[PDB]
Amino acid sequence: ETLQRCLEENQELRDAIRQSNQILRERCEELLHFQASQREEKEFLMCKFQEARKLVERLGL
Amino acid sequence: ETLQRCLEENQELRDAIRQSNQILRERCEELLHFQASQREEKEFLMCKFQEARKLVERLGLE
Amino acid sequence: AKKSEELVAEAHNLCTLLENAIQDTVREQDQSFTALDWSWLQ
Amino acid sequence: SEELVAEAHNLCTLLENAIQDTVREQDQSFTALDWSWLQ
């Protein structure tokens, strides 16, 4: 029947959204971790190139 | 009426996934763009690292 | 189960969060080393 | 609808891949370079 066909589609629709929702959720957490990794790489790189600037100046004197 | 509640929910869910799909595509494109700028930034930093290593080489031979 | 109103809200809020995570990542990265004074390279 | 559902799976897979690539590229770190010429 009509209600059973309709309920099969309903479940299929909810399963889909529920699956994407879990993917978004995990991907979002991953991207938030990547922001920490990204600020850490940059912080390291700022230090390193500040060190380089200081050496170069230092050596110039 | 139970069938009516279902067809109305199916249309709402279908609408959400249809919106959601057009949004996912846009998000994928931003990430592609973000990969192109990450790549330009590293290439730039690699030139700077190289120039700075060589300038320190130069100066240390005062 | 979830009410339908509810699955859609969740999925809407998760969409927003991903758009914002992306934007935040892109904004922090656009905060670029090229904007620094490298004229010490001389 | 079967197509909307198939497309969504397809876009999620692409979003998955796109995020993975990004967090693999940014894992090639400058911490790997030799910085000992700083002394």
Side-chain angles (χ1 to χ4, degrees), chain A residues 1-3 6-11 13-61, chain B residues 1-4 6-21 23-25 27-39 41-42 44-52 55-62, chain C residues 1-2 4-12 14-26 29 32-42, chain D residues 1 3-19 21-23 26-39:
Chain A
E1 86 197 314
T2 43
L3 184 55
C6 197
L7 294 158
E8 270 136 39
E9 187 176 353
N10 190 68
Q11 199 138 32
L13 288 173
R14 300 188 144 165
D15 284 335
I17 290 178
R18 208 191 294 128
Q19 303 199 37
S20 169
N21 268 359
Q22 173 182 198
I23 289 179
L24 277 154
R25 190 170 273 130
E26 293 154 6
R27 251 59 265 163
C28 282
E29 171 182 28
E30 174 147 37
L31 225 27
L32 283 172
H33 295 324
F34 172 88
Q35 302 190 227
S37 134
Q38 179 195 207
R39 81 194 158 167
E40 309 158 37
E41 175 75 3
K42 195 171 188 167
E43 282 153 17
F44 171 81
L45 268 179
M46 248 316 223
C47 292
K48 279 298 162 297
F49 283 119
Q50 298 168 157
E51 280 183 61
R53 185 182 28 99
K54 301 201 253 174
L55 188 55
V56 146
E57 305 182 2
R58 163 195 175 145
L59 286 178
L61 299 154
Chain B
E1 229 291 318
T2 314
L3 187 55
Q4 171 58 19
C6 202
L7 302 166
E8 202 166 339
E9 269 201 33
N10 284 349
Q11 163 162 230
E12 308 171 286
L13 294 169
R14 251 187 248 117
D15 294 3
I17 297 146
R18 183 152 46 219
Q19 262 54 241
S20 173
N21 281 161
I23 94 87
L24 284 170
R25 186 171 284 108
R27 254 60 283 172
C28 293
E29 317 196 0
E30 292 161 346
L31 259 3
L32 300 175
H33 176 72
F34 177 79
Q35 284 164 34
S37 341
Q38 187 158 57
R39 193 188 321 115
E41 185 83 347
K42 264 209 159 122
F44 178 80
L45 280 161
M46 275 303 317
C47 299
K48 309 286 125 159
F49 172 87
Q50 274 146 15
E51 292 184 68
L55 173 64
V56 158
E57 180 186 0
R58 166 173 302 179
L59 270 356
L61 282 161
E62 29 267 351
Chain C
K2 316 264 290 164
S4 220
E5 310 72 80
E6 273 180 333
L7 256 187
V8 180
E10 203 174 77
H12 187 242
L14 285 164
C15 278
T16 298
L17 278 184
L18 181 72
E19 176 174 27
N20 299 332
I22 296 192
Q23 276 176 342
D24 278 331
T25 307
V26 49
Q29 206 248 84
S32 173
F33 282 93
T34 54
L36 287 57
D37 183 346
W38 295 91
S39 63
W40 56 275
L41 283 157
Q42 230 86 82
Chain D
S1 158
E3 258 198 54
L4 281 175
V5 157
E7 207 188 10
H9 177 59
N10 278 12
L11 296 167
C12 289
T13 298
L14 296 163
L15 180 76
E16 280 186 297
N17 286 174
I19 306 254
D21 259 304
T22 297
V23 183
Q26 183 278 171
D27 262 293
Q28 302 296 300
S29 161
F30 282 85
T31 61
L33 297 171
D34 187 65
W35 290 95
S36 68
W37 54 271
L38 300 164
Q39 226 68 129

